[PDB]
Each structure stands twice: as structure tokens, then as C-alpha cells.
Design a protein around this nucleic acid. Structure first.
Ligand SMILES: [Mg+2]
Length: 212
DNA sequence: ACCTGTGACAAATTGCCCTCA
DNA sequence: TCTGAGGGCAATTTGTCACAG
DNA sequence: GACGGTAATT
DNA sequence: GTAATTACCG
């Protein structure tokens, strides 16, 4: 049974923009940190490859490009911004990377919490769908069901959706339908929704879900 | 003015392949 | 030989906007 | 490369 | 021969 990720709701609801590969590495960082500290973490190529069913080559490529793409990225807890890394990554040994996560982020990871096993998300491809599945997990019940109403503006400002998704039909076509379909096809969750409106504008989305 | 969907195009990401220390 | 660090790819998804309703 | 089984040194 | 201990190939 796969590693059980837990995280403060403050991270689930933080504002940031990360890719799938970056979020994948971040889950392992959160696991290492939580089992305790100083903030220095490590990643092995071959273990990453085995965890996510990748080749060693493509694992290496994903880690390397994720790592150089962290530079300049920031995290916002609502309203305080932090950088993820305070030193570049570096490799002491072949197939091994050592990273220095901002230790000031530690209390935000481990505190009103969200939890899910890593097997639930490791087949999701779209990072916004990972964000949505995390935000739904935050409200999940022991038995595996839940219901929550999310505001559209808060979704856009938390997941940092691109500007053209401020037009609602593109929001529907390229974000909502795709990420719900991904969740329904790639996780053990079964998800439905309905739109809440005020005048002509749609203001919230109401999600209901159960477990298979 | 506002709202909805679709058709097109561009830009980015995916799982691939090959090569060599 | 097994790893992994590079160099590429075509097919697919994601981001953007004109247009008709 | 790095490692590890193999042959080849002394 | 054995048994300790180094260079090379896949
Ligand atoms: Mg990859």
C-alpha cells in the first residue's frame, strides 16, 4: 500500500504554479520532512523511476528539468510569499540529487489537514487536476465521500489558472471537464458537479463525490 | 453591452527512441 | 552489462481568440 | 560511468 | 596446486 501523504490545509489552499513532475517530487519531499530537522532532502533516480513506472532515462530527464524549473517559483499562503528553494540543487553522486527546501516552509507542511495515499494521484497528468483532487481530499469523509462549494475566482487565484480561463466557456472546456474526466478515469474517486449561478455569471462550482 | 459553444492555430507536454561515458 | 546523462521525436493536450448565436 | 564477475598477476 | 590481491571486460 503506497506512501500516505499528509499536508496542512494551508498548502492545499496556497497559491503557486507547479508542473506535474514538480508536484510529484514535492510529494516525496513532504514525506521525508514529515518523518522526523533541517530541511535537506534527497532524490534517487531509480526509485523515482520505479515509483512512477518510468525508465531511468526519462526519470533523469524529469527530475533534472523539474529541478531547474524551480528557480524563481514562489508560494503564497493567504498573504505571505516564499521561495521553495534557497540553494540550487546539486548531485553529489551519479543518480542522486540533494536539495535544500526553504526551512521556513517546514511548519506550513506539518501542523486541520489533508491526506491521501500516493497511489491516488500518481497516474494524474494535468497538474490542475492534482490541485483539484487535493482540494477535494481536504473535505473527504472517513467513508470516502464529500461535498463542497468552491468559488470560481478563488480557484483561479489559488491554482493560478492562465488568463484566458477568465472566459467561462474556455474554463469549462479546457479545465473543468478535462480535470473531472481525468479524476474519474485515473483515481479511485467518482466525481460529479453542478454550477451555481448569480444572474448571468456562474460564481461557484459544487462538487459531490463518493468512493468506489 | 452581456452571456454561451465551436473551430482554428499556436505553444507546450507526453511517452517514446537512440547514444555514449 | 546496468545506470543514467544527454540529444532528439510525433502525437496529443493546453492556451488563446475570432465568430456566430 | 560504476559495478561485479573473471581472468590474469606476483 | 591453493588464497590473497590487483587490472579488464561486459
Ligand atoms: Mg518524462
Amino acid at each position: 500500500n503506497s506512501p500516505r501523504i499528509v499536508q496542512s490545509n494551508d498548502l492545499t489552499e496556497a497559491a503557486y504554479s507547479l508542473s506535474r513532475d514538480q508536484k510529484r517530487m514535492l510529494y516525496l519531499f513532504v514525506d521525508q520532512i514529515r518523518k522526523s530537522h533541517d530541511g535537506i532532502c534527497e532524490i534517487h533516480v531509480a526509485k523515482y523511476a520505479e515509483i512512477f513506472g518510468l525508465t531511468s532515462a526519462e526519470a533523469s530527464k524529469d527530475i533534472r528539468q523539474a529541478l531547474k524549473s524551480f528557480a524563481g517559483k514562489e508560494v503564497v499562503f493567504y498573504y505571505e510569499s516564499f521561495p521553495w528553494f534557497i540553494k540550487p540543487a546539486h548531485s553529489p553522486s551519479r543518480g542522486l540529487y540533494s536539495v535544500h527546501i526553504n526551512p521556513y516552509l517546514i511548519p506550513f507542511f506539518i501542523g486541520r489537514f489533508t491526506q491521501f495515499r500516493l497511489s491516488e494521484t500518481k497516474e494524474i497528468t494535468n497538474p490542475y487536476a492534482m490541485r483539484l483532487y487535493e482540494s477535494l481530499c481536504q473535505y473527504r469523509k472517513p467513508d470516502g465521500s464529500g461535498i463542497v462549494s468552491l468559488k470560481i475566482d478563488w480557484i483561479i487565484e489559488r491554482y493560478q489558472l492562465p488568463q484566458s480561463y477568465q472566459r467561462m466557456p474556455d474554463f469549462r472546456r479546457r479545465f473543468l471537464q478535462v480535470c473531472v474526466n481525468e479524476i474519474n478515469s485515473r483515481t479511485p474517486m467518482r466525481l460529479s458537479y453542478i454550477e451555481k449561478k448569480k444572474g448571468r455569471q456562474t460564481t461557484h462550482i459544487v462538487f459531490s463525490f463518493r468512493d468506489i
